[PDB]
């Protein structure tokens, strides 16, 4: 059966209205999203990762970077970048793009990661190159400089190209979890919500642990439920074990 038309409602019948045009950016984003939504069968996995010791390590490295006057503040998302990059090395089918006809998968041998950054004009997604080959200090410096560029609205078209995977960390603003949409032509996206201290069973008692909620949405034409579970688990375990750089 044919599709019903979009509702044609005279909203003025119910009170005052103001009809505004969207910005070109929002029109471009909306068009891309409408395409991706129908072409990409979405599955979303949820998980929680223990970052108690990572956070202690981050604070340690932040004082030791200040003593050396290195001018760098390590933020949690840099660790997530490296964990995602290491996971893309272990399961390379997540580092891929599916052709339009669904018949051919392009496996990428480079690892670039887009990171959503909030601006006075909304979230934009700069792409960072060779994340798997860069350290925490270097990536923190790039993120600071480019996020500044984003807030000042002078981001370059080139600086948003070449992504293999997107991270969208919104926990500084809220949510305990969320289910993002895949940023085509990538096949997966990681959402990050607000960490919370939770009682966690150690086998004999509950102890307080800083738990970070993460989510993974993915193109189900490429990734099945089992591999999605393997992938998010690798990111979980990697983040809960990282204590170098």
């Amino acid at each position: 059966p044919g599709m019903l038309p979009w509702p044609k409602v005279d909203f003025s019948k119910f009170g005052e209205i103001e009809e505004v045009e969207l910005g070109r950016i929002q029109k471009i984003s909306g068009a891309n999203l409408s395409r991706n939504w129908v072409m990409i069968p979405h599955v979303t996995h949820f998980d929680k990762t223990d970052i108690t010791e990572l956070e202690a390590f981050r604070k340690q490295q932040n004082e030791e970077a200040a003593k050396r006057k290195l001018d760098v503040k390590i933020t949690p998302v840099v660790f997530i970048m490296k964990a995602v990059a290491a996971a893309l090395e272990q399961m390379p089918r997540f580092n891929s793009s599916l052709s339009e006809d669904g018949q051919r998968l392009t496996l990428k041998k480079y690892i670039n990661i887009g990171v959503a950054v909030d601006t006075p004009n909304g979230l934009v997604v700069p792409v960072f190159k060779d994340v798997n080959k860069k350290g925490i200090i270097e990536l923190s410096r790039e993120l600071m400089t480019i996020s500044k560029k984003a807030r000042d609205g002078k981001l370059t078209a080139g600086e948003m190209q070449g992504g293999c995977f997107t991270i969208s960390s919104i926990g500084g603003l809220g949510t305990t979890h969320f289910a993002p949409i895949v940023n085509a032509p990538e096949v997966a996206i990681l959402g990050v919500s607000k960490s919370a201290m939770e009682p966690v069973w150690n086998g004999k008692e509950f102890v307080p642990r800083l738990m970070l909620p993460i989510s993974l949405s993915f193109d189900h034409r490429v990734i099945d439920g089992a591999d999605g579970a393997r992938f998010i688990t690798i990111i979980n375990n990697t983040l809960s074990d990282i204590r170098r750089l």
Copy 2:
């Protein structure tokens, strides 16, 4: 390329079957859902609101009205309506409708909220007008009257029109969270699941708090992840903080 047709299966070869036609209302709603699903890219945010003090206030107020013979029962969802109405005031992009070509956004000044009400014929969505201009007692009287009209199956078409936003509260029947579908031409819907006592860290120890799980699905063509996080946080904090009316 072209979509695979719907599966054709002779179900009678596995056992007894009975083919029934969908009701008149289910056919219309099913046609709307098919349209809304493919043209609205959904993101769903999850959150949990501390309603410990609010529930104590509600019961106290229900006692006050009882021992003064006011014949009004304050249910939790009326507080949710007021918090949503305050959020729609503070973030008016959520109180809007997108045109069918996705080019222009109608910002509504009035605030009417549809509230899912369960009936022997399933969930229906009566619409309550001027929620931002009505108190808790008045809205509770309206809810009592309309829910009976709904449960008795007497709702007119007018009583279901003009919605700006929908609340679907199913926690009385179960779920710890869920991801509802947006009710076009609205751009967001709040889901409400079953509250539970949870241990909540206060900086030194876990204390029991009554936490209410809520969810927000929204039209990603209109709302990005950052604004969705701001919005569900406003609903969260506003709801938790109510001590009046």
Copy 3:
């Protein structure tokens, strides 16, 4: 409004790539998933079930079976199949298939449940017949036999036919919840994620209980949000109360 086409990106400008043709099985699977995603408006419910006593009962029964030389190991998923089968008996609208034009619902009087099993070629879903009429021991035998057959790539066409409902349990690989896609022409699917010991309020304190997270995705044209909650609640209550077989 015309749909924007798939992005045309020269990925070789960012680094080395390898283009691989999908296998036939993977092509068909994607085609089936692409159709299901656009024609089924998905809602997903989440829940957690207390399996503390069920697990001690399964462990006790697996010990009795070995001590009685019954030579059968009982896995958690057979209990879930029977709980789903009982839910399908109690809410027969979930045991159904919607017609291609969305106008007519085929109610099924037989109860067959597909169970996702991992293979060298990914998850596949053999179908088990008359789950509501089979005991726990008998279903475990079929599960063991057919799971090995699936891993060997030896499933017959008949062993995949007749499904009424799918259970997809990925908790041995990770996730705390997930949102599966409905396996058309069925109307719902249950996802099962990793169990965890959690603090559960008993009225005056928190006690550790083994909580199993489950999720229910369903065709919203058939099932409304309230019936979805009733259904996941029945599975929850039945699974958390089983002490026989």
